[PDB]
Every structure is written in structure tokens, then in C-alpha cells.
């Protein structure tokens, strides 16, 4: 009686739900259907009747959360995404399915330039992406069309060099051949290990201003709160780790952050979208939970 489509980066799910279904009911159905047990990273993202991007809440009904239905033929449409990122994928991601969902989301984040990546690194990344899709390099099967699509490297990379597409393809293939004794999920993890060291990886960016009306970026990460100058998104100017922060609150456009050190002053910043200000609140609370849970590993078992 509720008609639902959920899209992960890997697959699509069409099914019906009772009109009494909570967010928890939907989340659980999705997780159990795809076999995901490391559910704490993930959420259901949709567009509300204010055309705001939101995350499904767990213990309100799906139909009481203002999902936009009109532009979709009355289907509830959701993207299943990772909302939170581990600090070290090697030690923390347990299931292949979890790894694969992170691989696809991170790679699309790089190909679309949501996160900066250097040219020579994007070639390394592309040589793994090829290995994921086609398996180990094999002279028997290799055809030039495997690399010949123009979708392996970010546009920003190829746009800043006077090279033919085939010069890029050959420089990918060279590396693709070089690292061949590897399974698929081994190279997905190699991809992720490279990607997680990118300066913009795992940072949730929000435009803010401090007391002095200086324009800054707030970066909510799995480790804490980064502060970026308005025109440098790679290198934070200062930062605060999750265990240093005691309390986060907003009133209107005004965020107040209180630190564990009682001797230190609260500090303030301004953020103009009220709906963004609740998402900032949610990302802070969620990343902080996982920060402590990571450090008590039994809380992370499946």
C-alpha cells in the first residue's frame, strides 16, 4: 500500500510496505534483503516536500516524513548511501558487501570530482577499477575496448593535459597489467586504501561564518570538526577531535560548540539554512557515536 523503490550503488529494490511502516522497518527490510549487517554507516536519502535532501528517520512512519511523491508517480524513492565513513577501511570493514558498497560510492565521488584527486593517483585508481570490473589482466581476453570508454578518469584530470585519450588508456593499462595476482575484493580494498588518504575524503562540507563574518567551511568528519578557509578545501586551518567536544547545539543560524575542557570558551559559527543546521547536528551526533564505538570494538561485531 506504500510503493517503494530503494537504489543502492549496486542494485535496485521494488516492493510494497504497510502504511504503518516505520523508517526502521524500511531500513531493516533493505539491509536484510541485501545481506548488509554493518548497517551503522548507511541511511536512506530522499527529497522532501520542501525539495530538501533529507535522511529517513527511524521511528516515525515512512508516510509521516514528508517524502515528495508527485514527481515520481506516487512511489517513495530513496537512495541507500553511506552516511558515515570508517577511519581505516582495512581494519574496520568486515563484509564484502559493505566494502563493495563503499567502493562504488567513493569511486563515483572521485569520477564526478566531489572529492579532489591528483592526476597520477586517478590513474592508479582507474587501474584498480578496471581490475574490479574485468578481473585480473589476461592477455588472452584483453581487448582495447575495456579501457576505451571515457569514464575511467575524472574530467579535471584529462582537461589539464594535452594528451590523447589513448595515452591515458595506455598509462592505465600499464598499471592494470602490473598488479594482476589479486582477487576482486582485494583490489576494491586497495582502491579504498588509496582513496581514504585523499584530503577531501570523508569530509562533509558546510558554508559557515565565524564571529568576524569570515567565510569558512565546516568539515564534519569521522574524526572531528575541521575548519577550512573559504578557498582551501584540502588543508584545514584548525580542527577539533570528537573526544574534545562535549556539546553541539544550534539556535536559528547560530551554532554553539562546547568543549570537554571546562576552562576553554565556547565558540560560535553561523550557518544560514535551518534544514542544513539539523543535518549538521545529525552528522555530528552520528560520527561521534561511531568514534567511541570504534574504540570499543565489541560494539562493532555482526
Amino acid at each position: 500500500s506504500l510503493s517503494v523503490r530503494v537504489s543502492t550503488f549496486d542494485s535496485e529494490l521494488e516492493f510494497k510496505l504497510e502504511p504503518r511502516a516505520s523508517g526502521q522497518d524500511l531500513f531493516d527490510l533493505v539491509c536484510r534483503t541485501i545481506g548488509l549487517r554493518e548497517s551503522w554507516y548507511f541511511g536512506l536519502q530522499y527529497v522532501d516536500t520542501r525539495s530538501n535532501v533529507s535522511w529517513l528517520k527511524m521511528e516515525k512512519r515512512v508516510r509521516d516524513q514528508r517524502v515528495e511523491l508527485h514527481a515520481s508517480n506516487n512511489v517513495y524513492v530513496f537512495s541507500f548511501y553511506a552516511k558515515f565513513f570508517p577511519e581505516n577501511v582495512s581494519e574496520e570493514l568486515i563484509q564484502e558487501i559493505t566494502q563493495h558498497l563503499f567502493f562504488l560510492q567513493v569511486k563515483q565521488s572521485i569520477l564526478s570530482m566531489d572529492i579532489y584527486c591528483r592526476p597520477e593517483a586517478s590513474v592508479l585508481l582507474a587501474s584498480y577499477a578496471v581490475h574490479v570490473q574485468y578481473g585480473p589482466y589476461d592477455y588472452e581476453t584483453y581487448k582495447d575496448g575495456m579501457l576505451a570508454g571515457g569514464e575511467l578518469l575524472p574530467k579535471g584530470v584529462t582537461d589539464q593535459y594535452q594528451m590523447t585519450p589513448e595515452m591515458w588508456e595506455e598509462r592505465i593499462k600499464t598499471w592494470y597489467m602490473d598488479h594482476e595476482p589479486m582477487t576482486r575484493d582485494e583490489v576494491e580494498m586497495e582502491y579504498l586504501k588509496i582513496a581514504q588518504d585523499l584530503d577531501m575524503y570523508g569530509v562533509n562540507y558546510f558554508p559557515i561564518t565565524n564571529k568576524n563574518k569570515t567565510k569558512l567551511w565546516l568539515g564534519v568528519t569521522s574524526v572531528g570538526l575541521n575548519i577550512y578557509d573559504e578557498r582551501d578545501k584540502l588543508t584545514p586551518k584548525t580542527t577539533f577531535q570528537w573526544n574534545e567536544i562535549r556539546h553541539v547545539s544550534f539556535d536559528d543560524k547560530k551554532f554553539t560548540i562546547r568543549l570537554v575542557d571546562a576552562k576553554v570558551s565556547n565558540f560560535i559559527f553561523y550557518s544560514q539554512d535551518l534544514h542544513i543546521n539539523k543535518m549538521i547536528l545529525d552528522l555530528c551526533k552520528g560520527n561521534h557515536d561511531l568514534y567511541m564505538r570504534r574504540r570499543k570494538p565489541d560494539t562493532m561485531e555482526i
Partner: protein, 120 residues
């Protein structure tokens, strides 16, 4: 012959009391636990080493990465480089990476960092 007495008992720790009302909702255990300051620091040392271990084991790939970057540098169209591209080139020229930078910033006091935040 022998004698003892226990004097100061002092504790420095983090209290974690979880709740499945909102946010992340799974029923993990233990739901309430405590981490001493030194457990936290020992975990932080262990994480730094895991990363420095990974850098050590990828020395061949990092070397390769700079070979490729040199090999294609002749073809660069600097007028098509971005803001971030220039920032990135400065960062490499200066020997900086994501983690050393963050570690450097956190070594300053929380009092200093809040005040630094405030004259930006």
C-alpha cells in the same frame, strides 16, 4: 619486614552511555562502557602505526606515482588547472600529507585552537 599502603586512586576516563531513541539505531553491546585516557591514547598510537605500516608497504607504488607524474608533466596545460590543483602542488612541494597536518594542528592546545579559530 615489609609494609605497604595504597595512597592516591585517580581515574581519567570517558563515559559512553548509548541510547536507541534517534540517530544510529542498532542494538549493539556493550551499550554502556568506559575508556580510560590511556586506552584512548594507546588506540591512537596503534592507528598511527597501522598507517605508517601501510605507507612502508606501498613504497613501490608511491615511487611509481611520482614517476608517472613526471612523465606526463611536459603535457600540462597550467591554464586548465584548478584552484585545488595548485593547492595540491603546493602541498606536495612542502612535504605535507593529510595526517601529519591534522596531527600537527591537534598538538596545539584547545584554548589556542579556539582563539585561532576566532581571528580568521
Amino acid at each position: 619486614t615489609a609494609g605497604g599502603a595504597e595512597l592516591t586512586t585517580h581515574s581519567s576516563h570517558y563515559l559512553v552511555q548509548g541510547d536507541n531513541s534517534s540517530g544510529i539505531s542498532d542494538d549493539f553491546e556493550p551499550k554502556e562502557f568506559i575508556l580510560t585516557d590511556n586506552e584512548m591514547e594507546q588506540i591512537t598510537n596503534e592507528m598511527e602505526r597501522n598507517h605508517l605500516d601501510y605507507l612502508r608497504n606501498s613504497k613501490q607504488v608511491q615511487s611509481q606515482l611520482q614517476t608517472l607524474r613526471s612523465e606526463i608533466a611536459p603535457h600540462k596545460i597550467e591554464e586548465n588547472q584548478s584552484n585545488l590543483d595548485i593547492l595540491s602542488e603546493a602541498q606536495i612541494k612542502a612535504g605535507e600529507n593529510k595526517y601529519s597536518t591534522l596531527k600537527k594542528l591537534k598538538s596545539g592546545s584547545t584554548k589556542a585552537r579556539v582563539a585561532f579559530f576566532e581571528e580568521l
